């Protein structure tokens, strides 16, 4: 089935009144406008998004909703570097340097914490800068992603 | 005359005690390690820096000092976009978006203020973000630069 428009997000209804089949995406598949997936129940779906969310698909976004059946997005955990800045100047340096690598970056719970996909040169850069960090398996949800508005 | 290393900075002495000649550099000339300049008084100086400061030569860095004579660096003011963030989350967005254009970026006075060289695309990006900014002439001193490793 072709999906051209999102039908809202599970946060806006009660998932218990529907049958929800999830499709599992990686963080790096969330901004593809044309893609093919297979749901957990084995349904082939093709996204061909006409007005895709700026940040990418997010956890719980609804691809299909008909009678009581729903297909929704689930984002897979991946290996992520959690960054704990200790000052505004550190946040500015961390975010300038990860921007110059064009690596993905996501807001954490505090405005001093960020998450970025594990990449060896990103860990090397944070080590070289003495920035506190740890590598954990977690979800990079697109709602928290920093955009790149005018890429070179 | 060839200069291989800096002697210090005018901030650490009384400039009135010396005869100070300056070499005028633009901001985008400060990271040069090999170059030839003429001072405001007309002296020829060639730099050949063996261990250049990582962020660039800064205002007041001393190239030469002998007796009461000094040659120091002056960084020319240039047209800059002054940015005023309203939150640490905005500082993170501004600094990531500017880093993704590889534009230069410097700390301002407050921890929410930054400066970047005026570029038409950078202004368009900040307008798109709704970031408070103004265009004016200012000095981009290398000691305040954010650099890339
Ligand atoms: Ni690039």
Curated annotation (Swiss-Prot), chain A:
Paired cysteines (S-S): none
Chaperone keyword on record: yes
Assigned GO CC terms: cytoplasm
Keyword hit for Chaperone: yes
Transmembrane regions: none
Keywords on record: Chaperone, Cytoplasm, Nickel, Nickel insertion, Virulence
Gene3D superfamilies reported for this sequence: Urease metallochaperone UreE, N-terminal domain, UreE, C-terminal domain
Pfam families (alphabetical): UreE_C (PF05194), UreE_N (PF02814)
MF terms (GO), sorted A to Z: nickel cation binding; unfolded protein binding
Function according to Swiss-Prot or TrEMBL: Involved in urease metallocenter assembly. Binds nickel. Probably functions as a nickel donor during metallocenter assembly.
Entry's family note: Belongs to the UreE family.
Protein name: Urease accessory protein UreE
């Amino acid at each position: 089935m072709i999906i051209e428009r999102l039908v809202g997000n599970l946060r806006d209804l009660n998932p218990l009144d529907f049958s929800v089949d999830y499709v599992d995406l990686e963080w790096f598949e969330t901004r593809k406008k044309i893609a093919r997936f297979k749901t957990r129940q084995g349904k082939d779906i093709a996204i061909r998004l006409k007005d895709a969310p700026k940040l990418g698909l997010s956890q719980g976004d609804i691809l299909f909703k008909e009678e009581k059946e729903i297909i929704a997005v689930n984002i897979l955990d991946s290996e992520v570097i959690h960054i704990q800045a200790k000052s505004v100047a550190e946040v500015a340096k961390i975010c300038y340097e990860i921007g110059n690598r064009h690596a993905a970056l996501y807001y954490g719970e505090s405005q001093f914490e960020f998450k970025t996909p594990f990449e060896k040169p990103t860990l090397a850069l944070l080590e070289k800068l003495g920035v506190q960090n740890r590598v954990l398996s977690s979800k990079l949800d697109s709602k928290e992603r920093l955009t790149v508005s005018m890429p070179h």
